[PDB]
Symmetry: D2
């Protein structure tokens, strides 16, 4: 057990940080995690979509090791470094942005979303922000307000910032059509905030915490046309979907519609804190000097890591692997859906952004608990906690991926057993 | 002209909104020495803006990070916890000036620490309002920008700020704002803006940082404490810049009898790696419900290892004592400068090695700053009017290199004369 | 023509006050209005539901005439009057409130809604307010935010107060079921604001400006149960539906569900400015002394009028007349619906709160213009301006009501002509 | 004991939140005489709180209202306009101190006039922020409560206030708040709270009313005007209490060279009937689009007739001159009281017949107020500390009855001695 440690944890730290695993990490590499006892876990969490290149990817660690011989922190706004500019250049070349792009780096995912909103507010001269129910954008007061889920993220913290409103995300399998979703945005214009007061509409192309809901292309196209008609900026939040998760570098790369601004974090850094925003030059250039920045933003350590993340994604063909592993997991879920009765209600996938929705959260906890007992680390998500989402490193060895898929099948088999 | 080529790339690839002070780029840094790409050496009196009290790449810090890189760099603590996080909370709880048992949690940025202290205070009190002070600086989120008591450049571009945040006058008796006047301005907020029983917290830097290194009078803290106790308001000390030995004790609040309910930390906590934290009264910290606090990069394993070694170094190397010794020597140099000069120096402010000199004019401050830069000395300015030079050299700076820095500083002032 | 007068109007007053009629009122009595030339108009507007007892009802004018011999203004909070207390007593006896009621009077409809929100905020200790799309509650910043229509009421005026959210009003004929409406309230709890932060849900039992939509009893029952479960107060806005319009004194009198607070204005005063709120004693008593009031609130003139309005409604059986006239108008609309093709899409009615929805606003303007040409004054309303709403005094002579109905039939007959 | 029976009915039927000052009830009032239900006579130095500059039931006013009652009492001006409204706008436009052509519109309450001046300013500037002053009083709506610079009793019960409203220090040189300090506090708001280009208006009473009858220094208006011109901010004069001859000219702003962009009016505008208005620069007033301004009771025909007769009476009866004569006589009495007494009078403030006396203590103010009440003289108090007696007698009060009132006042002060 870890129970002296958990006693220490409960004495020394607040209860408000929920902690899922009862065991403590001692070492991790690629898609394997060891506890203090040497028990091994196959990792289908990825630190919540942060390790698309795996724990301690060798080229990421080499890059960080080399940067530790140079410097770890100067504060970019005091003394800049070339690697930050180069990383911006590499992202500008790769991002789906219309016309010349520019990029800046911050530290956290919430900061990237919040600075995209700052940039959009200042470019448009407007305050309003429209997001979607079940969207997840951060734990800041502004990003909590944008977040479309009150429990547990914001119910403790009182009044939220004005001018943030939630529309319906298109989920046709749950009877929310593209029409209904567009109509809910229009109701916000008619009821809550005039279109010329809305600075940005912000959405995840694949909703992450909200349950791995993939946006229909038709919804993006009609949303783009609405934003173009009213001068509103369109923001794709790719904090969770970016860096090869969906089988292309950015989820937006699957669509013809382009966003004006795109946010990035998590596996950008391959396990080190960094985030960023890339977007149309003219939009990014709206804030005045001193208007953007941050102490830790663009950390030299995490910039060295991110350069190696891009290298690895392209050198190891990890977009392709994301599609290959995704399809294999989807086939296993369809067979579970057949082998079971009254359990699987939906299978959603784009690349290796894959989830299975179960009728009941109790069912999903049975599977998650069994997996944990048997050396497989699984995350749930969703409004009702009945979704298992799959976030294994895209570098996971195929034979170990199969072992995980087998344990998953075993966990489901215990439900009617 | 290679640095000309690099600054052209910077402007082409990144937004103008990130203001960058140095025209040269960092190639390597160690303790209090920074080298540019062409080999020129700079004495660091900036410390990455108070992030490097233990110096760039302190050997102990780097050794601890090197060892953690062989273990894991990221699990998401809320998914899989680690013992080093618990242990770091225990070490801060033991040291922090908190009445009764303390608890602590770690996030990533200084703004997150401030924003979570506000979340916790709102939760504990069931109130929404926040009082901060003019010239206070608390972060670049929408909520921490509203708390920050300087509109330009930080928040003028970004439109409406969240409700329930108000600014009082910080006590600066040298500038004719007495403790009485400052306390009276808090009471006017109660009388005019927001009832005391709707105020969750009063938040202040014990030494305002960006605001000009203004040291809070003890009488102001004790009167403020009595007002908070009387009204059930929490008192929050923001030590993101003042903490980890800068002022000659571990926390600036250690110089005072009065205790805060919550204390925020970041910057030199991590010795050059991204981490932040909040420590405070256990029953206040436990107010948010599980799930209510957290964050992907929070308490990064890398930065937690670094922070353990920062505390080790501060206590093993007697860096509180060094802060007092170096500050005393810098203050004597500033008083000599004040004598040798005519109409230049207006104030000298100091707690430990949180030291600043105020000049009549920002043109004067820039003349000294740029002389220093051309003679191998990196200096920062501050203050509502940009006429304050603040000193944030590593507390580990070799005494002979510090002396050289003070000689260059004196020569810079002499070019005024 | 009135065109020297209109020239004077455009020179001297702002354009933002829209004015419907091009002719000016010179005299009005019961349901007849004369212009300067002696042209007569049958009044189906009622000054927008203010004159359920008619222009210059003789007993209302006698009451005001008698009060003009006594006093017109003392400021109730300085010097009170017995008639205000008596009016509260009469409303307390008549209002559908559970347990003992209390009542206060203000001046405008928006004030009554805003004070109901003040009372609810203070009783519950919460800030949030939920309203419905197409709801109309006033032109104050708070009541504009509550109002579910951005054009033309709030699109000019920028950021709205935080904590106000819009759900879907149940309109089954337009495919918004009771289920869908309840589900939209629950989505607000899940996405925008936790239920323990919502002070009140505020709705018109019959939406007025939003197009005369009558609330299904089942929606009120389920909304009551939701509010009871979460401690939220339920507010019926009867500013437009009250004082016999719907064939009972209050629209809420048709339902078993009771609201906690009810707002009143318009025909409360029979043509003189007054408004009020009545509700559960315990709720009304929540604000502290000095917390409610107003210079003109409870004007002695308009209190004398309102006493005579209640007298007249009961003495002249105006609830019954409201049902009799309503049914007669509904029969005429059904015959128009038959006599026409592709014109009438809905007929809605509760008592003499009656409306006809046309396919097109252009159609409704053809009818309104013809009526005006032929001595009948008609109002439109609705999100799309395609609804004609009927607000004739309940005292209108039957023969003149028939003359109006005939002109209305003629106006419709010109559409396919 | 019939008045005991009535106060029991009051408490049973109405909320405690309406604070009522007099224990007796009004039966009749005329000019400056009020009679209770038992026949006792009171000299009115309250004027219904500055509503009766022309006295209770001024014969001209009542004649005008009596005539309008034979015509119509309510059409809803936005449905059917009336000429008397246009004519009233013309008469105010002619008289108001506005640079260039003016326009005016009428609403119902003082708070509505203030709230619509803010709506207009927000629209014209496209900005949201509002600066008011501590102790300013502007109404009881959520927006005007936020503007009001006194939290108790007015807004302490009602939770969060709308964003973008901040309070500066009003200049009171007798209390050690110089014009310099007041101007500096506005600039600190720009520096700390809200950028100048996000401020729509600065709003102030030229003579603060509830705040203690503080007369604005001319130098403060001219410096404030220069700051507004420099930043494109509008200057709003709130004359709800100061207007219609109280200060010895029609508007208090008529005493000053500096002109406001917008002026609000109510209270004695209507001579005892509910009406308010906003007058200002035509191009500012025309900013909102048609439909953007309005209101059911706005510009009530009854109150418009009364207001025409108020202006007639002010100019025909030379009530500006009477205001100066009566104020001068009251001030000489206060200075005699100040001499005959020891430690009681601390200030005498006066513009015209907006006159107040400040005492050391509110217990002192209540002793005088209650002596006066028991000897047939109705007096009001004011001020942050309730230690100010303010004088609002009708400007029509007979000189011999005014003299009697001043003799009772002197006797009341003597019971201190
Ligand atoms: Cl590349
Ligand atoms: Cl009765």
């Amino acid at each position: 057990q870890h129970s002296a440690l958990n006693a220490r944890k409960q004495q020394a730290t607040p209860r408000g940080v929920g902690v899922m695993c009862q065991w403590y990490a001692e070492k991790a590499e690629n898609a394997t995690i060891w506890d203090k006892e040497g028990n091994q876990f196959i990792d289908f969490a990825g630190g919540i979509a942060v390790l698309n290149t795996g724990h301690r990817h060798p080229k990421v660690i080499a890059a960080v090791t080399e940067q530790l011989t140079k410097f770890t922190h100067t504060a970019y706004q005091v003394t800049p470094y070339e690697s930050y500019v180069a990383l911006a250049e590499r992202i500008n070349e790769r991002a789906p942005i219309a016309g010349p792009a520019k990029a800046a780096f911050f530290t956290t995912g919430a900061e990237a979303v919040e600075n995209a909103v700052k940039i959009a507010r200042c470019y448009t001269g407007r305050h309003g922000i429209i997001t979607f129910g079940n969207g997840f954008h951060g734990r800041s007061f502004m990003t909590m307000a944008m977040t479309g889920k009150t429990a547990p993220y914001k119910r403790d913290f009182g009044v939220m910032p004005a001018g943030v409103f939630h529309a319906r995300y298109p989920v046709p399998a749950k009877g929310i059509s593209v029409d209904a979703a567009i109509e809910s945005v229009e109701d916000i214009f008619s009821e809550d905030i005039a279109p010329h007061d809305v600075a940005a509409i912000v959405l995840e192309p694949v909703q992450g915490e909200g349950g791995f809901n993939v946006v229909p292309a038709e919804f993006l196209k009609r949303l783009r046309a609405i934003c173009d008609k009213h001068g509103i900026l369109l923001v794709a939040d790719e904090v969770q979907s970016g860096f090869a998760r969906t089988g292309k570098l950015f989820a937006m790369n699957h669509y013809e519609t382009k966003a004006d601004l795109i946010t990035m974090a998590k596996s950008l850094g391959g396990g080190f804190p960094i985030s960023g925003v890339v977007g149309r030059a003219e939009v990014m250039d709206a804030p005045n000097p001193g208007g953007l920045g941050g102490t830790y933003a663009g950390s030299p350590i995490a910039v060295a890591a991110a350069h190696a993340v891009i290298d690895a994604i392209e050198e190891e063909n990890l977009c392709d692997r994301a599609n290959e592993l995704g399809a294999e997991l989807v086939a296993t879920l369809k067979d579970i859906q057949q082998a079971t009765g009254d359990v699987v209600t939906d299978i959603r996938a784009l690349g290796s952004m894959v989830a299975v929705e179960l009728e009941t959260a109790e069912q999903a906890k049975v599977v998650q608990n069994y997996a944990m007992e048997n050396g497989l680390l699984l995350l749930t998500c969703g409004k009702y906690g009945n979704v298992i989402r799959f976030l294994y490193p895209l570098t996971i060895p195929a034979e170990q991926f199969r072992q995980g898929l087998d344990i998953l099948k075993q966990g489901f088999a215990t439900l009617k057993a």
